[PDB]
Amino acid sequence: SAVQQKLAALEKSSGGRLGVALIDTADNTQVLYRGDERFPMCSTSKVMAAAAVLKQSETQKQLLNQPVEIKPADLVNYNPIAEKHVNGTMTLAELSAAALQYSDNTAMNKLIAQLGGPGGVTAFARAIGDETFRLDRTEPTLNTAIPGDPRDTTTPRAMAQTLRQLTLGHALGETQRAQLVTWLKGNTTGAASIRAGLPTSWTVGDKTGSGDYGTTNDIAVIWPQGRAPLVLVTYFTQPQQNAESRRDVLASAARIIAEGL
Structure with a gap:
């Protein structure tokens, strides 16, 4: 399609490797660019950890x-919210919100611990039918984003389908699903990524991610005004370990996708 030629050209112009998956829920059509290649998830993994805790809460109603105590030893490299509560507590809801909306890394590590380690996050993915997702490490080492390293990766196609199920489908209970959507819609880190390539009238819930090798990711559910929602995943990584983030590539990919619907 025109869209795949424009995405290829965007990728060529950027010097990196771009992965895109769009699901149009109106007709369940998909648009894929490197849809089955693995990319480092970086903080986009935090959605799976938060959703796993939500699933637990369906049975543990008060979970x-x-x-949860925040101790100094818990603090890692980026903890904008956990920092505010050192030597105090945060609820699992507050840690989930912090992990999603501020990309708090300490918060993510507490969610992983609640699930029994990275294998507990991966297990939830498998439970909802995602055989591709793998979480292997905790924060911050899951962001190393080493070329070829399959740790802490997924594919655009898999993540798109899983994000659809978590937010628009029924992988989660009704109250949990609504809470996840509310959290994603209140993300604070996404203004320069997918959101920047879309009409201002559209409602977006997203989770960004960044890591080494200039890895720059965003996964989003999109609610156009008067139109079925879309799921869009944009993964981008670069060949230099110290490359700078390229959120503009994600905005441009979203703009190209938006041209056609």
Whole structure:
């Protein structure tokens, strides 16, 4: 399609490797660019950890109100919210919100611990039918994004389908699903990524991710005004370990996708 030629040209112009998956829920059509290649997830993995905790809360009805102590030793490299509560507590709801909306890394590590380690996050993916997702490490080492390293990767296609199920489908209970959507819609880190390539009238819930090798990711559910929602995943990584983030590539990919619907 025109769209795949424009995405290829965007990729060529950027010097990196771009992965795109769009699901149009109106007709269940998909647009894929390197849809089955593995990319480092970086912080986009935090959606799976938060959703796993939500699934637990379907049976443990009070789980999200469970206080969790934040100790100094828990702090890693980026903890904008956990920092505010060192030597105090945050609930599992507050840690989930912090992990999603501020990309707090300490918060993500507490979610992983609640699930029994990275294997517990991966297990939830498998449980909802995602055989591709793999979480192997905790924060911050899951962001190393080494070329060829399959740790802490997924594919655009897999992540798109899983994000659809978590937000628009029924992998989660009704209250949990609504809470996840509310969290994604209130993301604070996404203004320069997919959101920047879309009409301002559209509602977007997203989770960004960044890591080494200039890895720059965004996964989003999109609610156009008067039109079925879309799921869009944009993964981007570069050949230099110290490359700078390229959120503009994600905005441009979203703009190209938006041209055609």
